[PDB]
Design an enzyme around this catalytic site. Structure first.
Site, PDB file in Angstrom:
ATOM      1  N   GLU A  35      -5.075 -36.108   6.295  1.00 38.83           N
ATOM      2  CA  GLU A  35      -4.876 -36.192   4.981  1.00 38.83           C
ATOM      3  C   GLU A  35      -3.471 -36.175   4.473  1.00 38.83           C
ATOM      4  O   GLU A  35      -2.979 -36.935   3.833  1.00 38.83           O
ATOM      5  CB  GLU A  35      -5.689 -35.194   4.149  1.00 38.83           C
ATOM      6  CG  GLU A  35      -7.372 -35.341   4.057  1.00 38.83           C
ATOM      7  CD  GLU A  35      -7.670 -36.696   3.726  1.00 38.83           C
ATOM      8  OE1 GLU A  35      -6.959 -37.299   2.802  1.00 38.83           O
ATOM      9  OE2 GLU A  35      -8.956 -36.922   3.709  1.00 38.83           O
ATOM     10  N   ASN A  46      -4.107 -44.122  -6.270  1.00 39.52           N
ATOM     11  CA  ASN A  46      -5.167 -44.995  -5.790  1.00 39.52           C
ATOM     12  C   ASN A  46      -5.043 -46.240  -6.976  1.00 39.52           C
ATOM     13  O   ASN A  46      -5.419 -45.864  -8.052  1.00 39.52           O
ATOM     14  CB  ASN A  46      -6.526 -44.460  -5.857  1.00 39.52           C
ATOM     15  CG  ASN A  46      -6.475 -43.436  -4.815  1.00 39.52           C
ATOM     16  OD1 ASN A  46      -6.424 -43.291  -3.677  1.00 39.52           O
ATOM     17  ND2 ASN A  46      -6.840 -42.102  -5.323  1.00 39.52           N
ATOM     18  N   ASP A  49      -8.468 -47.402  -8.648  1.00 40.86           N
ATOM     19  CA  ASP A  49      -9.282 -46.605  -9.710  1.00 40.86           C
ATOM     20  C   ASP A  49      -8.055 -45.766 -10.518  1.00 40.86           C
ATOM     21  O   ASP A  49      -8.880 -44.979 -11.473  1.00 40.86           O
ATOM     22  CB  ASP A  49     -10.295 -46.082  -9.295  1.00 40.86           C
ATOM     23  CG  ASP A  49     -10.002 -44.612  -8.337  1.00 40.86           C
ATOM     24  OD1 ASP A  49      -8.743 -44.622  -7.870  1.00 40.86           O
ATOM     25  OD2 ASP A  49     -10.696 -44.063  -7.751  1.00 40.86           O
ATOM     26  N   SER A  51      -6.528 -43.048  -9.795  1.00 42.57           N
ATOM     27  CA  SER A  51      -6.654 -41.666  -9.582  1.00 42.57           C
ATOM     28  C   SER A  51      -5.548 -41.203  -8.632  1.00 42.57           C
ATOM     29  O   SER A  51      -5.105 -42.078  -7.901  1.00 42.57           O
ATOM     30  CB  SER A  51      -8.471 -41.186  -9.103  1.00 42.57           C
ATOM     31  OG  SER A  51      -8.276 -41.798  -7.658  1.00 42.57           O
ATOM     32  N   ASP A  53      -4.478 -38.525  -5.231  1.00 45.64           N
ATOM     33  CA  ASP A  53      -4.818 -37.379  -4.212  1.00 45.64           C
ATOM     34  C   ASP A  53      -3.733 -36.567  -4.252  1.00 45.64           C
ATOM     35  O   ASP A  53      -2.636 -37.029  -4.068  1.00 45.64           O
ATOM     36  CB  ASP A  53      -5.239 -37.835  -3.079  1.00 45.64           C
ATOM     37  CG  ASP A  53      -6.370 -39.015  -3.066  1.00 45.64           C
ATOM     38  OD1 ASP A  53      -7.284 -38.890  -3.844  1.00 45.64           O
ATOM     39  OD2 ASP A  53      -6.351 -39.984  -2.286  1.00 45.64           O
ATOM     40  N   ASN A  60      -8.859 -35.262  -5.041  1.00 42.82           N
ATOM     41  CA  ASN A  60      -8.749 -36.027  -6.199  1.00 42.82           C
ATOM     42  C   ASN A  60      -8.799 -35.798  -7.534  1.00 42.82           C
ATOM     43  O   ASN A  60      -9.588 -34.930  -7.946  1.00 42.82           O
ATOM     44  CB  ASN A  60      -9.767 -37.186  -5.837  1.00 42.82           C
ATOM     45  CG  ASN A  60      -9.883 -38.376  -6.637  1.00 42.82           C
ATOM     46  OD1 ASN A  60     -10.369 -38.644  -7.735  1.00 42.82           O
ATOM     47  ND2 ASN A  60      -9.094 -39.264  -5.978  1.00 42.82           N
TER      48      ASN A  60
END
Length: 130
Positions: A35, A46, A49, A51, A53, A60
């Site tokens: 990750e 992202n 959408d 959003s 991380d 998220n």
């Protein structure tokens, strides 16, 4: 902060992650590795959408932490996403535990399915004294 492998393994054990909701320490290590590369300040936007991380576990902003700019967002962990960019991983761990407390468990992170599920993950904790 960028953690060294064994240094992180011991920190996660001390924070009660070993076997949390049936998830072994080696599995959490495999997740952190893919990750973020064990980096607490890693962030990923992202574009699809809108959003983001955040942190070592790439949590998220639509469901787990609040950053104010994510559309249709919620805050299950009730934390500010800023808290997940600290060198001290206490808050990131509490958030990861909340995510694992959902029915999907460790499978909530697609990266775990692609790189960790059904594999030999002992390598992530071998030699660490945990």
């Amino acid at each position: 902060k960028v953690f060294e492998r064994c240094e992180l393994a011991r920190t996660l054990k001390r924070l009660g992650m070993d076997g949390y909701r049936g998830i072994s320490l080696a599995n959490w290590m495999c997740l952190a590795k893919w990750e973020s590369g064990y980096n607490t300040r890693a962030t990923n936007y992202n574009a699809g959408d809108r959003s983001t991380d955040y942190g070592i576990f790439q949590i998220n902003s639509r469901y787990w932490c609040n950053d104010g700019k994510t559309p249709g967002a919620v805050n299950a962990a009730h934390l500010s996403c800023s808290a997940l960019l600290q060198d001290n991983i206490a808050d990131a761990v509490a958030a990861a535990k909340r995510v694992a407390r959902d029915p999907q468990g460790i499978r909530a992170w697609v990266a775990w399915r692609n790189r960790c599920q059904n594999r030999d993950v002992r390598q992530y904790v071998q030699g660490c004294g945990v």
